[PDB]
């Protein structure tokens, strides 16, 4: 496994850690999710092109579309939360607790 795959996997892991940090600003959470998706798209495209697996050239597009739909959903949720509080801070979402 060459170093390009290693760099893409490292980027995915960095984005996952950034999502799990939650300094504030749920918009940053969505940004980290979509950075993870971008890394996934890049690495899947590289693998599929490298192995000349023709029928799987379908797969990256599909992934993109589905993930983008999720972003839409996430954005909607963020917007609604802001309408209740005036801002999208993470610490506003403490009404429900363990």
Partner 1 sequence: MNPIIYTTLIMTVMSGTMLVMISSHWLLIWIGFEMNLLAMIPVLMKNFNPRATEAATKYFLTQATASMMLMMAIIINLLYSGQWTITKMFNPVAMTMMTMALAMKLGLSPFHFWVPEVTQGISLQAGLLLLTWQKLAPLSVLCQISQSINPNLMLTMAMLSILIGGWGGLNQTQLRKIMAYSSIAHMGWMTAVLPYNTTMTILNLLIYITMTLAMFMLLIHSSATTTLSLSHTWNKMPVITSLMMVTLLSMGGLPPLSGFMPKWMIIQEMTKNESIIMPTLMAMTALLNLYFYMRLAYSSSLTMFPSTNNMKMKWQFEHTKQMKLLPTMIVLSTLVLPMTPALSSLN
Partner 2 sequence: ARQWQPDVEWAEQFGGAVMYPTKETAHWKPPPWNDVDPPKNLTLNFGP
Partner 3 sequence: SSLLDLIWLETILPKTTSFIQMKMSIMVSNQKGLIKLYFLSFLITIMISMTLFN
Interacting residue ranges for partner 1, rule: CB under 8 A: 1, 5, 9, 12, 16, 19-20, 26, 29, 33, 36-37, 40, 43-44, 47, 51, 53, 56, 59, 62-63, 66, 69-70, 73-74, 77-78, 80-81, 84, 93, 95-98
Specify whether the CB–CB gap between 59 and 45 falls below 8 A: no
Does residue 21 belong to the site contacting partner 3 (CB under 8 A)?
yes
Task: Tell me, by CB under 8 A, how many residues bind partner 3.
Answer: 15
Q: Give exposure, 41-80, as e/b (b: 16+ Cβ within 10 Å).
A: bbbbbeebeeeeeeeeeeebeeebeebeeeeeebeeebee
- Please pick, from the candidates 1, 3, 20, 65, the single residue that binds partner 3 as defined by CB under 8 A: 20
DSSP-H helix ranges across 1-98: 3-21, 26-50, 58-85
Binders of partner 3 among residues 23 to 62 (CB under 8 A) are 23
Does residue 90 belong to the site contacting partner 3 (CB under 8 A)?
yes
Comparing CB distances to partner 1, the nearer of 3 and 62 is: 62
* Block residue for tokens 């950075």: 35
């Amino acid at each position: 496994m060459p170093l390009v795959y290693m760099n893409i996997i490292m980027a995915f892991a960095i984005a996952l850690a950034g999502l799990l940090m939650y300094r504030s600003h749920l918009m940053s959470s969505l940004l980290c999710l979509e950075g993870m998706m971008l890394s996934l798209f890049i690495m899947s495209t590289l693998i599929i092109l490298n192995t000349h697996f023709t029928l799987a050239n379908m797969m990256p597009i599909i992934l993109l579309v589905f993930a983008a739909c999720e972003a839409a959903l996430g954005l909607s949720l963020l917007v609604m939360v802001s309408n209740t509080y005036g801002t999208d801070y993470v610490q506003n979402l403490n009404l429900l607790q363990c």
